[PDB]
Amino acid sequence: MRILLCSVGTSWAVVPEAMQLLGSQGFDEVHVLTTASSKISPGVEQLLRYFEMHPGPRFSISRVQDFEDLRSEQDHMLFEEVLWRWLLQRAPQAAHRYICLAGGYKTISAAMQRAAALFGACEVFHVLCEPRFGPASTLEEVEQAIATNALRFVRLGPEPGWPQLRLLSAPSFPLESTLQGPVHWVRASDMRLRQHVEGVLERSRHILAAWEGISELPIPALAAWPPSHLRWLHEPLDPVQDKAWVQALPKVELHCHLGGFATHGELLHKVRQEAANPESLPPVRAIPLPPGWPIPEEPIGLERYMRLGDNNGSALLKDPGCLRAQCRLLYEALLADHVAYAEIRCSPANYASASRSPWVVLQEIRNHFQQAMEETPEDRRCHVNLLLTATREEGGDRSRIARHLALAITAAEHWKNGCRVVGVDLAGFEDRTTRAAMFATDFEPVHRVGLAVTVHAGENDDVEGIWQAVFKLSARRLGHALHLSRSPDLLRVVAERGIAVELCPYANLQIKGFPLDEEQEGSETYPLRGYLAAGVAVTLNTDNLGISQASLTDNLLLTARLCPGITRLEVLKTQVFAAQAAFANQAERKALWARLAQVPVPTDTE
Amino acid sequence: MRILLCSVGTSWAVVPEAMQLLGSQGFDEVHVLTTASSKISPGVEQLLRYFEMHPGPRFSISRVQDFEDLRSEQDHMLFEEVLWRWLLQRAPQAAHRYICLAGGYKTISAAMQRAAALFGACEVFHVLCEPRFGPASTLEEVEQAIATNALRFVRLGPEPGWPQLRLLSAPSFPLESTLQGPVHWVRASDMRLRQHVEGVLERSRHILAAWEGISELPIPALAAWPPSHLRWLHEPLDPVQDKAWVQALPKVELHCHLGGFATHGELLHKVRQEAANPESLPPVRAIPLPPGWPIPEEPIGLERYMRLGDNNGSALLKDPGCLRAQCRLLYEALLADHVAYAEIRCSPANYASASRSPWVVLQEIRNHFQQAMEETPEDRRCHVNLLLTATREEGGDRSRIARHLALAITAAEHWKNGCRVVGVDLAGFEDRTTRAAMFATDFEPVHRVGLAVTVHAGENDDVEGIWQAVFKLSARRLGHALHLSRSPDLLRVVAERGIAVELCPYANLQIKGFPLDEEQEGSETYPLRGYLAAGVAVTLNTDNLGISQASLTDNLLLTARLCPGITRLEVLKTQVFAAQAAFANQAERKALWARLAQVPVPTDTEQ
Ligand SMILES: [Zn+2]
C-alpha cells in the first residue's frame, strides 16, 4: 500500500505531478483535499477528468466545507482540524503515507507538513515544474510535462510522528461527508481532535521539561505537571491557602485507633444512638476538653490525653450496634478525608463479652469494614486493613496480649482478600519495666507466621526502648518516636533499615508540645524535617481522630506550623513513605499506587 | 522588544505588509532572510529602498549563499540550516519572535512554521494582499495597501517550542556572514545544528514512548532508549551473544572474599612473587581442579570447594607483600570487570602475626584499597568497602570472632570517607549446633554501633537458620539462601522486609549442582527467577573470584543457563537490587546511582 495525500489550490496540475513521485510504480491510491472556494471548481473538474483517463488507483477530491478564503485565523484553524481528520480517515497508517506540499495557500502547505510531523508520514515532498509550457495548466500540458521529464521532486524526509499521536484513528474523530457526485464535501462537528493534540503536546512538553530531575519527584506521574506547578511543589506549604489541595490529596493512614474516633461531639451521640441495647449504655461522663482544643495552651500529657477518650472504647464498643456504627462512621470519615489506604488499630478482646468472643468481635469489625469498602466504587474506595493492638499495662498481666497475638495469627491466615489483618501494634504503658525485650519472646509466633509489627514509643524519652523495638521485636514501623536524634547511631539505623516512623502531629503537639509558627528551627522543633533530612521514611497520621479532634488533612497542614518551611513536596514524600511502609500485599500496593498517581492540580500557583 | 522575521520570494511586498501586523507601533527589529537567486535582487533593492524610508526600526537583509533555486533535497536542507542559525542569531529570545511565512517557496513557508514550532515563537502569521492593485508589487501600490487597509493577517498562534531546543544560542551554531553593502550573505559551515536537533527530537520521542512504563524500568535513564532497545531488554539473555553487553555493564559486588581471589594459576604466582619474605613462602600445594572447571560434571561440596583455595588465604596473606599484591590485584580485577561498587570480605585476624596485629592488617588492607581507588579516575573508580568476616567454628572457639567484631566496631568509626568498614559477615561452619541465634548475644554491640550484618549461610538445607538470621541477628543480607521457597512465610518475610539475598551462580552450581540449560523449570532450577517473581531483592555475586574461576560477568551470563528465559532486564534489576542493598552511605550511593545510569547501548537489536 502507498497512499498519497495532496492539498490542491488554484493549480490543479500539482496532483498529477505529485502522482509521479514514485515513477512508473505510482501510488495505490491518492486522496486530494480541497476547499469550498469557487475559484478551484474548474481545477476539481480537471482533476476528475484526469482521474478518468488515468484509472487504477482509488480517487478522492474531498472538499472542506465552509472554507472559501483565508478570512482570519478561524478559517485556518478549521482547515487544520479538518485536515487532521481527513488524514486519519484516508491514510490510517503513517508507514505508507505520502504528503505533498505543493497545493493550497502558504499556510495550507505549512499545515500539511505540520500534520505530517505530528501524525507521521512515509515521505513529505514538494513538486516543481519548469515554466516552459503554454502558448502545465491543461491536460495535454501536464502529459507533456510528465513525458518530457519536467518535474522536480524535493523530498523533505520521512516523519516519525509522535508516540501517542500515531495511534489516533478515524472513528475517534469522524469526518462527516456529504456526496455531491464524485466529490466529497467534508465537515467537522467539533474541534475535539485539535484540543486533544494540543493537550498531548502540552503534556509532552511537561514530561520532557521534567525529565531531567524525575528521580527527585516522589510520584513519577508528577513529571507531566507544568513547570510552574512543579516549582509550586518545592515552595513551603501554606496551612491556610493549601486547605483544599491537602484535602483533595489521596492520603495513606497508618496510625489510627478505632477506639478513639467517636469520643465526643455529635459523632459520639451518633454512635451511642445506634446501640443494640440502649439500656446498657454507660452514662455520658463529663470530659471537658482543654481550652483551645485541638491546640491547647499547654501540653496535657499522655494520662489526660487517654482520659479524654473515656466516653468511647471498651465502655461503648461492647455493644454490637455501637461497634458497627463506630466502624461505619470511621470509614465515612476516611472517605471524606480522601484516604486511599488505611490501617485501623483495634482491640477486639477489649470489646468481648460472655456471649461474644474476641474472634466474634474481630470478625464483626472486619466484616463491617469490608461491607463499607464493597459499598464504595473502586475509584474512591478506601482500603482498610486491620492491626491488632497488644496493650502492655502496669501490673504484669499478659493474657489479653496472648489473646490479641493469637487472634492476629489466626486472622492473618483467615482473610486473604479485602479487609485483612496485617500486623500487630505493641502499645500501652511506657516504662523501663514494659520495654520491648520483655515481650520479645511473645512475638516469635508473630514473626513465624510473617505478621508485621509496629511499636509505640511515644512518651518515654528512652532511646533504649526504640533500640529494643528495632532489634528485639523486629518492628517494621515505630509509633511516634520523637527522640531519634538523641542517638545518631539509632537514627542512622532507622534510616538504613527502612523502618518507618509514624508521626502524629496534632497528638504529638497535644501530649508533648512543640514550638509553633517559629521562623527558625532549633533544639525544640518537631523532628519531621530533620527526620526527612536524615533519610527516615516518615509518615503523618491522626493517632486518634476523636481525642485529637483533627483529621489527616489537619495534621498535614499542622506540619506547616510545626516545621518552618516544610514544602508540600515533602507532604507528597510522606504520602509515598506511608505507601511504601504499608503492611499491604502486591495487589493492595498496586491499587494504592494507582490512587496516589492522581495528585490534585494546584490552584493559584506562581 | 519585538523582532520580526520574514521570508522573501519573488514578491518583496510581503515584508512591508508584515511590518504592519501590530499596527502603528510596528516592530523594533525587522530581519529579512532570502535566497541567492538572481530573481530576488530587484526585490532586495526594493526592500532596501523601503528600509531607507521609514527609518524607524532596525533592519537586516540576509541572503542565503549556496542556494539559488530549489533543485533537490540538499538545497532545502542547506536552507533549513541557514534558517535555524539565522533565527538563533537574529532573534535569540523566543518570546520576541514574530515569524512570517508569506514569502519564499512553499517549502520555505513550511520550514518557517517548523522552525517556529521547534525553537519557539511569540507569533506565526501569514499576510494576504487584495488583488485590487496594479494595472501590490511596487512602492506606491504597497503604500496604498497599507493606507487603505487591504491586508489580512492570519496569526497561526504562538509556538511554545521544545524545552531543550529553545535554550540553544547563536554562539554555539554561528553563521559565516559576509557583507556586500547593506546585505548579509550568510552560510553554514557544517550541519551540526540539524544533527543536534534530530538527536534531541529522537531522544524526546524515545522518552515519550517509554513514559507510560517508566515505573517498570529499574534504571530511569532507560526511558531514553529507543523502543527497539527496550523490547530487546525484555528478551531473554543470551550467554554467548550478550557477553560484551554484560561485560560493559556497571556492576555491584556484594559477596566477594578477599582470601579466595588468587588461589591458583598466574594470579597466585604473582601474589607469591610479590612476597616480602620469599624464604617464608609455603610450598605451592598440589590442588588439582575438578574436571570441567568452572563447570564440574558433578557438585563437589563445600569442603572440597574450601580446600580448592588452600594455596591462598591465611597460609599466604600473612606476608605484607603478598597481602598488598592480593589487594591491588583484586582491585584491578574489579576494574577490568567494570564493577562500580564492591564490598570485600576479609578476615584480618587470620592474617595477623606476632608483630602484625589484626588492626595493623585491617589498616593495611584498607589503605591498599584506598590507594588503588585514589589512583583511578573518578569516572572509572570502583568504590571498595570492607566487611569483616566473623567465621563460626565447631568446638566453640569464639576469640577470633570477638576480635573481628571488635575490629569492625573500631574501624566503623575510624574511617568516614573513602574505603571504610561497613558491616560484618557471619560465615564459617553452619550446623544445627551453630545456628544464628547462638550468636545473637555476640552481635548486640554490632547493632549498637549501627554496623550492618550479612549472614553467610553455608552447607545446609535448613530454614531455621535463615529465620534466626533474619529475626535474631537482624541480618540485612543473606548469602546463599537457596531454600527460601521451601518456607512460604519466610519468603514473604524476606520480600517484605527488603532483606537481600546474595546469590553466587557459579559457586552455587559448583557446590550444590543446579541443572543447566533445562527446558522450562521445575523442582531443581536455580531459585533466582522464583525469588524475583516473589518480590525478593536478589543480587548476583562471585563469592570467590579464584576458587570459582569466574568473574561477575561470568556469573551474570551463567544465570541465563541456570534460569531458562531470564531477561537481561532482570539482570539490570539485580544490579539495582545490589545498589539498594549495599551497606553504603549517601555519597557512595549517589555515586553508584550515577554510575548505574550509564547502561551500555545494545548492539544486536535487529532480530
Ligand atoms: Zn497511638
Ligand SMILES: [Zn+2]
Ligand atoms: Zn562466600
